Amino acid sequence: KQWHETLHDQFGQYFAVDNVLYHEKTDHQDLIIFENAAFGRVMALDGVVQTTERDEFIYHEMMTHVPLLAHGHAKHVLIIGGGDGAMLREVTRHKNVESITMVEIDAGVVSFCRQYLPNHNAGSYDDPRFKLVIDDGVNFVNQTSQTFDVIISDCFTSAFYEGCKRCLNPGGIFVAQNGVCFLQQEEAIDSHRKLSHYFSDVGFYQAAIPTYYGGIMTFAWATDNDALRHLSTEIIQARFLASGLKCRYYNPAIHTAAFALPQYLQDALA
Amino acid sequence: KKQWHETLHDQFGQYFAVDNVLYHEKQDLIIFENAAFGRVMALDGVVQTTERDEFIYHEMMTHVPLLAHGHAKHVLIIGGGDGAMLREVTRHKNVESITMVEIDAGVVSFCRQYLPNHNAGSYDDPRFKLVIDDGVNFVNQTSQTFDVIISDCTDPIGPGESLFTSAFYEGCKRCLNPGGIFVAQNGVCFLQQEEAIDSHRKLSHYFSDVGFYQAAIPTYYGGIMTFAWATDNDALRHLSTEIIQARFLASGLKCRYYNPAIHTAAFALPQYLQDALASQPS
């Protein structure tokens, strides 16, 4: 038995299935979790791989630390999306953070992942600083009048952004997952154009996650603080040393390098 | 269409729609066109190269060392029957001689016919010389001598093998000018790092500075790939991005993946890889 990703019609990745843990199909949607020898538990929705037990660390580490440590002093973080809770787990590892908020489309997708992908959250939901909200992320343009230092968007409308800015403290950073960059860059170009309307410094960093096929993936970076992505690797290293994470992909060399983009991507943005 | 699956691993792989098969011989060798990645060459079920993404591989394999070394006048390519590597090395005006050693003359003229955009007319270059021979047997040299050696190949990890000694890496050193660099393709690093550990151990017997750089090639599945770096000149991999940029402004390549930011950053390795390599000594 095998399982093919359907994200593109012309090519994909596939996996051997050792065992299916969960499978559901409606006329509209199709959700699955199965074990594979190489990548452990694999979650896939409507034929598109969402996350993998064995490689999610790259995604979540890079998605989280790069901004948290670039910002010096992030005390409140908002996660949009991230039902699996991996992001929560990583944000949790910063002792200096004092509040975390996860906005999610519904309370079902979280307790589901909690049951079938326990190593994503890794007990992180029990953390005292955590708060779950059920809502449209875009709805949070509503704000509870709440206010954050970092926003991590774990999934890309313009409506979503103005809201993001309204409720970002002054020094703050917005990062979002912006897809694999080899095949097409329009998504990057569009993101940049939109984000630039609300932020004075907009760019991208990158990481290559095995299970998001096609080379490097691009993470949007948006902030009014135009220094934050030109920090010396030395200072990141100082910040890294303590609070002291022990990561498995991330490190201060990686962090700095993350911001070098391949030539095709840069061209495309000019 | 029809689908074609890579077989490199039993547990998972990449697959492609086939629009049209240009060639098939069952050594099971195939070349077919795919909408996304153009022409795709595959041997015994394992993707060798792809029209659309080979640039990333060949750029990073050729320019990182050539421009890190300042003044590479003679280059040896081992493997590289497709000629993409020859193409890129060709783009350095300062290079004055290029030698490709290959297992047989068939594999080159074959690729010349079916993958013409790999070589891109590069074989007509005046400075080029093709040799047909075993790469390890170029432990013989013609008393020949190089400034950069670029290998498809790598003294393989083996069960009863040696841990420090290789005929290949020794040969490579015998025939490397004093300032010289050896780079080789060392596989994708996510699933396993034993191949990197072993490479490091062996190469360290013959070279005083041994490490890796990386790049993520879409069509070599599983995230970043690792390129071995071996040299007696220990400053080569700690050059400022500024100097690389200078060297890059001209000779003036226009590259599609490579640039001096990329070059420098290529040497940052993810944490898991470093810890796998942490045993190997300071």
- Annotation says B152 is catalytic: yes
Spatial distance between the Cα atoms of B223 and A213, rounded to a whole number of angstroms: 8
A196 Cβ contact list (under 8 Å, min separation 6): A202
Q: Is A47 on the interface with B (CB under 8 A)?
A: no
The CATH classification of domain A51-270, taken from the options 3.40.190.10, 3.60.21.10, 3.40.718.10, 3.40.50.150? 3.40.50.150
Report the amino acid identity of residue A220: A
Spatial distance between the Cα atoms of A125 and A127, rounded to a whole number of angstroms: 5
Which of B3, B12, B18, B50 to probe the A interface (max A CBs under 10 A)? B12
Helix axes B194-206, B271-278, angle to 10 degrees: 50
CB contact under 8 A, B262 and A262: yes
* Contact present, B257 and B56 (Cβ < 8 Å): yes
- Do the strands A11-16 and B12-18 form a parallel or antiparallel pair, or are they unpaired? antiparallel
CB contact under 8 A, B36 and A251: no
Structure tokens at A213: 């096929």
CB contact under 8 A, A210 and B190: yes
Contacts of A257 in chain B (CB under 8 A): 264-266, 268
Output the CATH code of domain B49-282: 3.40.50.150
* Contact present, B262 and A260 (Cβ < 8 Å): yes
Spatial distance between the Cα atoms of B160 and A212, rounded to a whole number of angstroms: 37
CB contact under 8 A, B34 and A15: no
Structure tokens at B91: 């783009």
Domain locations in chain A?
1-50, 51-270
Taking alpha carbons only, the member of B215, B201, B186 closest to residue B277 is B201
Closest A-chain CA to B192: A38
Measure CA A139 to chain center.
19
Determine the topology of domain A1-50 in CATH: Spermidine Synthase; Chain: A, domain 2 (2.30.140)
CB contact under 8 A, B5 and A14: yes
Determine the topology of domain B1-48 in CATH: Spermidine Synthase; Chain: A, domain 2 (2.30.140)
Tell me which residue has tokens 């010349």.
B112
Q: Which long-range contacts (CB under 8 A, 24 or more apart) does A113-116 make?
A: A113/A43, A113/A83, A113/A84, A113/A85, A114/A85, A116/A21, A116/A22, A116/A33, A116/A41, A116/A43
- Check whether B193 is labelled as a binding-site residue: no
Structure tokens at A1: 């038995």
Distance in Å, alpha carbon of B20 to nearest chain A alpha carbon: 13
CB contact under 8 A, A249 and B272: yes
Structure tokens at A220: 């949007």
> Which of A9, A15, A249 lies at the smallest CB-CB distance from B12?
A15
Q: Is A70 on the interface with B (CB under 8 A)?
A: no
- Do the strands A148-154 and A168-180 form a parallel or antiparallel pair, or are they unpaired? parallel
Distance in Å, alpha carbon of A116 to nearest chain B alpha carbon: 21
Q: Which method was used?
A: X-ray
Q: Is A245 on the interface with B (CB under 8 A)?
A: no
Report the amino acid identity of residue B159: P
Helix axes B167-174, B194-206, angle to 10 degrees: 40
Tell me which residue has tokens 């000694």.
B165
